[PDB]
Design an enzyme around this catalytic site. Sequence first.
Site, PDB file in Angstrom:
ATOM      1  N   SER A 133       0.547  -1.332  -0.118  1.00 55.08           N
ATOM      2  CA  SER A 133       0.010   0.042   0.114  1.00 55.08           C
ATOM      3  C   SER A 133       0.842   1.325  -0.081  1.00 55.08           C
ATOM      4  O   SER A 133       1.545   1.647  -1.203  1.00 55.08           O
ATOM      5  CB  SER A 133      -0.734   0.034   1.239  1.00 55.08           C
ATOM      6  OG  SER A 133      -1.738   0.875   1.398  1.00 55.08           O
ATOM      7  N   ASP A 177     -10.270  -4.343  -3.965  1.00 59.99           N
ATOM      8  CA  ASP A 177      -8.847  -3.507  -3.360  1.00 59.99           C
ATOM      9  C   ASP A 177      -9.468  -1.927  -3.428  1.00 59.99           C
ATOM     10  O   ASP A 177      -9.742  -1.334  -4.336  1.00 59.99           O
ATOM     11  CB  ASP A 177      -7.592  -3.668  -4.348  1.00 59.99           C
ATOM     12  CG  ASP A 177      -6.591  -3.558  -3.452  1.00 59.99           C
ATOM     13  OD1 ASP A 177      -5.673  -4.264  -3.363  1.00 59.99           O
ATOM     14  OD2 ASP A 177      -6.532  -2.392  -2.368  1.00 59.99           O
ATOM     15  N   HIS A 224      -7.822  -5.065  -0.185  1.00 62.42           N
ATOM     16  CA  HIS A 224      -6.466  -4.485   0.138  1.00 62.42           C
ATOM     17  C   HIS A 224      -5.540  -5.385   0.967  1.00 62.42           C
ATOM     18  O   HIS A 224      -4.497  -5.708   0.580  1.00 62.42           O
ATOM     19  CB  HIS A 224      -6.536  -3.280   0.899  1.00 62.42           C
ATOM     20  CG  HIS A 224      -5.638  -2.244   0.911  1.00 62.42           C
ATOM     21  ND1 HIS A 224      -5.266  -1.736  -0.066  1.00 62.42           N
ATOM     22  CD2 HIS A 224      -4.825  -1.650   1.874  1.00 62.42           C
ATOM     23  CE1 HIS A 224      -4.129  -0.852  -0.014  1.00 62.42           C
ATOM     24  NE2 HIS A 224      -3.915  -0.865   1.217  1.00 62.42           N
TER      25      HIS A 224
END
Length: 293
Positions: free
Chosen positions: A105, A244, A271
């Site tokens: 991320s 996501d 995610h």
Amino acid sequence: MDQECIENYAKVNGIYIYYKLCKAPEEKAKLMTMHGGPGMSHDYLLSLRDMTKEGITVLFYDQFGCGRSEEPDQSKFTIDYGVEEAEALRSKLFGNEKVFLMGSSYGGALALAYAVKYQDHLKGLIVSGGLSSVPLTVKEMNRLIDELPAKYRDAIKKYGSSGSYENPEYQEAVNYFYHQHLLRSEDWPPEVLKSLEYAERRNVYRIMNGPNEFTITGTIKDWDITDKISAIKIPTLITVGEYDEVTPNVARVIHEKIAGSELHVFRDCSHLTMWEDREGYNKLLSDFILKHL
């Protein structure tokens, strides 16, 4: 079986950084990891520990101002500093060895910025739920918000516009989004909550990122190095969940720019794919790493 990860306090340029290094048996290569946020902690990435039984050493650490690390001067709350912090740690910790860099991320964005400058010190690159642009990510997250039921969407466009992030009708909208695009599991593991707790406890998330995942008003709001990443020439694995919050379109942009990179979209994942499909995730990464020794 596993060997007790080892924890220690560093002292990279000027400040104290915490790092957990889980080693071997049968060292084939090392993997440095970068948690997301910005402003979370290494804890939610602990599931990647399994790759130690594959001969891959996984290096964990709380970036500046996160978790157990001490924060530096606010003027250093930057992706560029985080890069130097990672390089500095690597160099001071492994001398001139080559290593594999994973990033989750925001950690994915940090990994990309790192690689762009120090891919020389790199063997391989893994970007999960990452991004090369904050503006692109924001536009995609806005679409996901608009597909939300009228209630939660309206509650975000009302209380979000007045800074009423504390409002209950607003937090209820954040939980719905999160359980759809952040982690799609019943029981959120403990390691995820610790990192979440750490994000709210320290000051990195609030300052660099903002109130929450989809309200990025922090200092990285305009960050975008999409035009630089094509310079990355090392083997690269890009993964992204189907649902996501940092959309696959965002992942595609990275893929397009890095020649030879592989792109994998985990079905029914969002995610935090290390937890949603811990085994296929760990497998995919370990396969990628080993075939590139």
